[PDB]
């Protein structure tokens, strides 16, 4: 009796499933399976089958510990073939990061292979996605955003990878107002100008008027340079006197605006 087909190696997938076959000549001939040095049985894990002139092992749920040399014994006749099990792990480590306070952060790594779930931890605990936590796949990068940051987001982050995982740190930084609001004595008609100054660019801020935030019109013109903030309030006159509060973060200030 002749073997008319070899096995093949196999590169898989841990947990994946896998065969080996071989064919040979003659329809009645009996074959043994061997792995490191033993005997091959039916289990949860090996199937033999055979149909004919073809003889397959199958192997469900592979393990780093499956991988190596299987060999068919036909008689005297003997061929071997190699499976190669490839396991999930992190390729590339993740930078600490820190962000001004409002200003989005983002935590990036690389995986080994394709369709990965993601599964980020916040000091040991799953995120929930949401407004705030932003999660990405982009083939075998993935990305946790957390937008809008607080003092509260500063925390060790972590990404699992089947049994492998990366930490980071985030620090977020406060915004401090550097420049404060001046009180503003002017008159009827008279533009006037409140102007703060903060540590970052790029951050979100409100401006109120006794309390209700205001947006700018032709009457009330908000600018920002570099750090500098500004509220350009034009004609002005009585209904214009009021409490101005500029506010950023967790950073506030307010002054007053007196009009003649």
């Known amino acids: 009796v002749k ?32 792995h490191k040095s033993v005997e091959i049985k039916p289990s949860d894990k090996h199937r033999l089958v055979s149909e004919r002139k073809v003889h397959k092992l199958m192997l469900q749920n592979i393990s780093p510990s499956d991988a190596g040399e299987y060999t068919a014994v036909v008689g005297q006749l003997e061929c071997k073939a190699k499976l190669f099990v490839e396991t999930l792990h992190i390729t590339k480590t993740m930078k600490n990061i820190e962000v001004p306070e409002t200003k989005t952060a983002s935590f990036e790594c690389e995986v080994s292979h394709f369709n990965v779930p993601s599964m980020w931890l916040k000091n040991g605990v799953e995120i929930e996605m949401s407004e705030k936590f932003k999660i990405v796949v982009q083939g075998k990068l993935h990305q946790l955003i957390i937008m809008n940051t607080s003092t509260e987001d500063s925390a060790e982050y972590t990404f699992v990878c089947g049994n492998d995982q990366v930490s980071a740190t985030l620090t977020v930084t406060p915004i401090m107002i550097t420049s404060m609001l001046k009180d503003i004595n002017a008159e009827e008609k008279d533009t006037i100008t409140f102007e703060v100054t903060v540590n970052y660019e790029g951050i979100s801020y409100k401006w109120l008027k006794n309390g209700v935030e205001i947006k700018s019109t032709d009457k009330c013109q908000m600018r920002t340079k570099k750090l500098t903030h500004s509220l350009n309030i034009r004609n002005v006159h009585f209904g214009d006197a009021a409490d101005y509060t500029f506010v950023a973060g967790k950073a506030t200030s307010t002054a007053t605006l007196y009009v003649v």
């Open 3 to 34: 073997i008319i087909k070899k096995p093949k190696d196999v590169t898989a997938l841990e947990n994946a499933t896998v065969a080996f076959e071989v064919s040979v000549s003659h329809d009645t001939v009996p074959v043994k399976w061997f």
